Amino acid sequence: MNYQLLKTFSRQPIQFGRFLARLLAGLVNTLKITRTSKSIELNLRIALPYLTPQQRIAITEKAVRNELTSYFEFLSIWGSSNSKNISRIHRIEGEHFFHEALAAKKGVVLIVPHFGTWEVMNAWCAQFTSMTILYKPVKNADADRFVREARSREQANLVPTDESGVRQIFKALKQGETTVILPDHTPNVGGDMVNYFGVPLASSNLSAKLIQKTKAKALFLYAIRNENDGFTMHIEPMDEKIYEGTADDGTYVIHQAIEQLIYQYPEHYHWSYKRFKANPALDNIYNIDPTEALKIVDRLKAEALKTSTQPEPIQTSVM
Amino acid sequence: MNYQLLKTFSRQPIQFGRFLARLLAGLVNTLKITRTSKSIELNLRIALPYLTPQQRIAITEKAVRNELTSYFEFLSIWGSSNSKNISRIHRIEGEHFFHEALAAKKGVVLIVPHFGTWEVMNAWCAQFTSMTILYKPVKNADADRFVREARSREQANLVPTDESGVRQIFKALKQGETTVILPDHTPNVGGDMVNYFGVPLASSNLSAKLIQKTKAKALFLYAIRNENDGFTMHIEPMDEKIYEGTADDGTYVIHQAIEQLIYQYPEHYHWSYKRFKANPALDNIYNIDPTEALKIVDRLKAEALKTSTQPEPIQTSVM
Ligand SMILES: CCCCCCCCCCCCO[C@@H]1O[C@H](CO)[C@@H](O[C@H]2O[C@H](CO)[C@@H](O)[C@H](O)[C@H]2O)[C@H](O)[C@H]1O
Ligand SMILES: CCCCCCCCCCCCO[C@@H]1O[C@H](CO)[C@@H](O[C@H]2O[C@H](CO)[C@@H](O)[C@H](O)[C@H]2O)[C@H](O)[C@H]1O
Ligand code: NA
Ligand code: NA
Ligand code: NA
Ligand code: NA
Ligand code: NA
Ligand code: NA
Structure with missing residues (x-):
């Protein structure tokens, strides 16, 4: 349908194409576009380490x-x-x-x-x-x-x-x-x-705070497009453990659900967001070279598991 | 007018946005976009060597x-x-x-x-x-x-x-x-x-062939947009020398006119085209590293001037 596409591209006032070109041009001229691509690929590196380098690129491109x-x-x-x-x-x-x-x-x-x-x-x-x-x-x-x-x-x-x-x-x-x-x-x-x-990340507690106090029902929702159609929508109850413990324990149950969703559908998560910055050790990981970034992350995932067996609250300390 | 823009973006069938996103995605995923940018900048390097590195970037971005x-x-x-x-x-x-x-x-x-x-x-x-x-x-x-x-x-x-x-x-x-x-x-x-x-480049002789045989009038034409308006169009007679000599001498007169136009309006030439490839010494200059590319070009602009004083037809030999 390339034509009915152009048929309306060409029907609009000429200053519209001009405005759109300046927008694209800004992106091609800022390197905002290739910065996004490396952030996606670093995020996949971090969250999905079992991907081959070949599988990353395929999911990066689909993502x-x-x-x-x-x-x-x-x-x-x-x-x-x-x-x-x-x-x-x-x-x-x-x-x-x-x-x-x-x-x-x-x-x-x-x-x-x-x-x-x-x-x-x-x-x-x-x-x-x-x-x-x-x-x-x-x-x-x-x-x-x-x-x-x-x-x-x-x-x-x-x-x-x-x-x-x-x-x-x-x-x-x-x-x-x-x-x-x-x-x-x-x-x-x-x-x-x-x-x-x-990876310990600074995270919102809002969902758990709302749910654990009010005893409101928590539902996990997402929608995925169907090839040239609409969208399938999925409604899943949150694990009942979300009601237990502190707000942070509830947030963790929410994190597990997102992880499982990402594991099944990595190409459908919005990887552009620089989520893994949110740790005092990780503030610069999207600026530096990805392979050093990943050494810092691997360093941190190890410390966090070792410190969770230790009585000391190391990872939850905010400084 | 960002809104009346979105008002029609959002009025079109959803598969239209999908098709457009796959097009953009292809470009961001092929590195066709940043390949274009380096070709423009190499072309400006070659044709407009007197630009500061600061002026190149400004014209690259406007181009x-x-x-x-x-x-x-x-x-x-x-x-x-x-x-x-x-x-x-x-x-x-x-x-x-x-x-x-x-x-x-x-x-x-x-x-x-x-x-x-x-x-x-x-x-x-x-x-x-x-x-x-x-x-x-x-x-x-x-x-x-x-x-x-x-x-x-x-x-x-x-x-x-x-x-x-x-x-x-x-x-x-x-x-x-x-x-x-x-x-x-x-x-x-x-x-x-x-x-x-x-730089000697493989070039069309069609304009000169047509003009010199038929004695048709040659006009040099170009149009430049006016900021949020239409376009000023310029019609200039080609130098009468275009009728003299061989077709290649006529082509050279056409090349001079284009050069002068580019000198006055470098931001308005379409620099993406890999024109300077068209020389047997220059086949790879857009693939290699620009600073070596430019050494090869500078090598060639010097040989061509030295060989034009020499009786030998060096640069016009096609092999
Ligand atoms: C829907 C996508 C949005 C379009 C926006 C950007 C598209 C432009 C990218 C293509 C880049 C250069 O693409 C080039 O365009 C020119 C016009 O300039 C096309 O040229 C075609 O039409 C022109 C104008 O009648 C003729 O000069 C030519 O003989 C013919 O082939 C070329 O076939 C194509 O190689
Ligand atoms: C006309 C240009 C074409 C648009 C196509 C691409 C545009 C998208 C690039 C922006 C990238 C992320 O941009 C982000 O978008 C979200 C929606 O997801 C906006 O979010 C906004 O609306 C959403 C939905 O109601 C709310 O969740 C949010 O509270 C509000 O701020 C953010 O303010 C912006 O930061
Ligand atoms: Na994982
Ligand atoms: Na909505
Ligand atoms: Na806690
Ligand atoms: Na020059
Ligand atoms: Na036309
Ligand atoms: Na000649």
């Missing part, structure tokens, strides 16, 4: 393509009506757990890793529940309008990423409603050193 | 952006009606020479370097003359349809890039009509070693 594809699909999703987006949901596994958790009326925490095409699940979810979501305003103003408009359409209640937003989320849960937390980025402020692929 | 911009503008031009494209011509310098050459009824050869946004001149030119143009079918089939459709709309007579097309062009000129030759690429088959920025 580059798949993450890029998801952002375009996000645009399509955000510019589409709710019914169109709901119709994009081809199949759902585990729908039962979602309606059941709604039935319990103790709240629902949807745990969504940066994986596949998660934005497509919102319109479908929103027809069964009120949704309250953390929202960081987007730097550029028109992107923020375009996203806020799409959230307005999907009925989402946006709250600030601060304590007042957390309070509104707690309130939403206590009223039997739903929240979506993306738990797998490094928090801007704080928090807890929790192992991620064997 | 990357400007060549990319021209291809998007070509799409817009090819998908636009003739009147829309004519309206995109903001100003014309030297229109007089064009109507006068048409008046002489000995034919008109429009010499168009790969520079700026040349496709925008066609619709304007075609309202005064019949145009016959060499056409190589585009590899991909829908691109070929999209381009052939645009040429059909612009009234262009397409002829094959072989002797039969050259014959049709000669016939068109003898009937007082017009042809457009892009003279500044390396021919697929043959031809003559003519200095380009001091």
Whole structure:
């Protein structure tokens, strides 16, 4: 369909192609593009060490393509009506757990890793529940309008990423409603050193804090595109251990679920994010040479296992 | 206008964003993008040695952006009606020479370097003359349809890039009509070693052959975008020396005109093309390390000047 493609490329005002070319040109001229590719490949090195160098490149290439594809699909999703987006949901596994958790009326925490095409699940979810979501305003103003408009359409209640937003989320849960937390980025402020692929990383405790206090039901969700179709969406109950222990133990149970998802579907995780920076030993690992980076990481995964048998709280010390 | 941009990005079918992402992904995954950037910078090294390293990067970056911009503008031009494209011509310098050459009824050869946004001149030119143009079918089939459709709309007579097309062009000129030759690429088959920025390069003789035999008028044409507007188009008569000597002497006069254009507007030449490969000493200069490449080129620009004082035809020998 290269032609109906060009047929609309060529139908738009000429300043549109100009604006798009300057955007691409900025990327080709900043080396932001090849910096991304090496971060993906370093991340795969760290999280999936058993890949051959041949398998890494194959997954790196599918991941580059798949993450890029998801952002375009996000645009399509955000510019589409709710019914169109709901119709994009081809199949759902585990729908039962979602309606059941709604039935319990103790709240629902949807745990969504940066994986596949998660934005497509919102319109479908929103027809069964009120949704309250953390929202960081987007730097550029028109992107923020375009996203806020799409959230307005999907009925989402946006709250600030601060304590007042957390309070509104707690309130939403206590009223039997739903929240979506993306738990797998490094928090801007704080928090807890929790192992991620064997590496202690500064991690959010928000999901566990919400769940363990309110006894809300925790569901693990992700959606993967089907070749020239819509998306299969997967709803899985979080292991009941998430309710036990400290918030950090709950966060660790969330980390295990993400790891298992990544193990099965490494090409569908969004590897561009520089997650493994979030350790005081690892602040520079994306700047330095990858093979030294990996020596530092391997150094650290070993210390952390040896220090966990030791009575001393070494890895969770934040300094 | 980032929003009305996204407003149509998001209005298209989701498989459209998918197709576009796979295209980008292919480029980021092939290193075709950073290969292009080093070819541009090597070309500027060769043709514009007086640039500081600081000035090169600035022009490299504007050239990357400007060549990319021209291809998007070509799409817009090819998908636009003739009147829309004519309206995109903001100003014309030297229109007089064009109507006068048409008046002489000995034919008109429009010499168009790969520079700026040349496709925008066609619709304007075609309202005064019949145009016959060499056409190589585009590899991909829908691109070929999209381009052939645009040429059909612009009234262009397409002829094959072989002797039969050259014959049709000669016939068109003898009937007082017009042809457009892009003279500044390396021919697929043959031809003559003519200095380009001091470097003997295998070059087309077609423009000079046409002009010197038929006594058609030769015009030098180029168009440059105006910041968020259309394009200024420039029509300049070729130096009368183009009629003198051999076809290769005529080609050299064409090369001087392109060099002067590049000197004034280096950011508007399409530097991605690997022009300086076209010498038996230079076949690998884009693969090797640029600083050795440039030693080989500097070696060659010196030999060529020393051999031109020598009675021996060294540089024009093809082996
Ligand atoms: C017009 C250009 C074409 C767009 C195609 C590629 C654009 C994507 C590149 C940006 C890369 C990551 O960019 C990141 O995107 C996410 C969504 O995933 C934005 O996220 C924003 O919307 C999402 C979804 O409601 C929320 O989770 C978040 O709170 C909010 O800030 C981030 O603000 C931005 O940092
Ligand atoms: C949908 C993708 C978006 C397109 C944006 C970028 C695409 C451009 C990248 C291609 C780079 C150079 O690509 C080159 O383009 C020229 C036009 O300049 C094509 O040229 C084709 O049309 C032109 C114009 O009628 C003729 O001069 C030529 O005889 C014909 O083959 C070449 O066949 C192709 O080799
Ligand atoms: Na692992
Ligand atoms: Na969404
Ligand atoms: Na703890
Ligand atoms: Na020069
Ligand atoms: Na044209
Ligand atoms: Na000669």
